[PDB]
């Protein structure tokens, strides 16, 4: 509650400064503070929340992958025993990553999702819930791996159901949701055919709706469509 004494508007202002300074841990703490003021977030504020924690967890995920690769190489045949240090430090990074994911999921559960009535906010937060369960799933190995995966799947599915009912196929949130659910299928759920089908249907349905858009909206939608195409090119 270290941000409890700062005004909501000052927290948002400082989150934007932290972004300019590439101080994403600060940015996340400011936006957590803003969320804990208890008011719903605007579109811009939701983006700030997402940018901050995307960059924090992004650094942790990249570090975890470096360390996991070293750990796995240490457990091949002919590898010298180097002691517990690699495992220990990988566990340290993994625990910090899980703590960030838990923090985000806690904000969504208390009480961003329950107060989100509009499709754009509700889908945004449910996508975020899927994303941060997906990051937990990337590092999970024990008894709860399956339940973490199902938690991600359930959040993404509720978001998809709403987005398909309430949003046009070119909406960037809908597009980024489908992109990420497709990555979930490919990388987490061992369902590459589901991933490919989802990416292709999403891309084709957005293509057929581009004619309705302004030039600026067209640029926003085609940016995410190109990521879908990039993945299909990687996967096929």
């Amino acid at each position: 509650g270290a941000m409890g004494s700062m005004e909501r508007a000052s927290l948002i202002q400082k989150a934007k400064l932290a972004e300019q300074a590439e101080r994403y841990e600060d940015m996340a703490a400011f936006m957590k503070g803003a969320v804990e003021k208890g008011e719903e977030l605007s579109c811009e504020e939701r983006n700030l929340l997402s940018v901050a924690y995307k960059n924090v967890v992004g650094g942790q995920r990249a570090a975890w992958r470096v360390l996991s690769s070293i750990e796995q190489k240490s457990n091949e045949e002919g590898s010298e025993e180097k002691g517990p240090e690699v495992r220990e430090y990988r566990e340290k990074v993994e625990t910090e990553l899980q703590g960030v994911c838990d923090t985000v999921l806690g904000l969504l559960d208390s009480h961003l999702i329950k107060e989100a009535g509009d499709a754009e906010s509700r889908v945004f937060y449910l996508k975020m819930k899927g994303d941060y369960y997906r990051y937990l799933a990337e590092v999970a190995t024990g008894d709860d791996k399956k339940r973490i995966i199902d938690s991600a799947r359930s959040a993404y599915q509720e978001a998809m159901d709403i987005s398909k009912k309430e949003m046009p196929p070119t909406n960037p949130i809908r597009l980024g949701l489908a992109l990420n659910f497709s990555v979930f299928h490919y990388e987490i759920a061992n369902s590459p055919e589901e991933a490919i089908s989802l990416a292709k249907t999403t891309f084709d349905e957005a293509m057929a709706d581009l004619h309705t858009l302004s030039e600026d909206s067209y640029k926003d939608s085609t940016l995410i469509m190109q990521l879908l195409r990039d993945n299909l090119t990687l996967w096929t």
Partner: peptide
């Protein structure tokens, strides 16, 4: 794979 950027 690429996942979604922040807007």
């Amino acid at each position: 794979a690429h996942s979604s950027p922040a807007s």
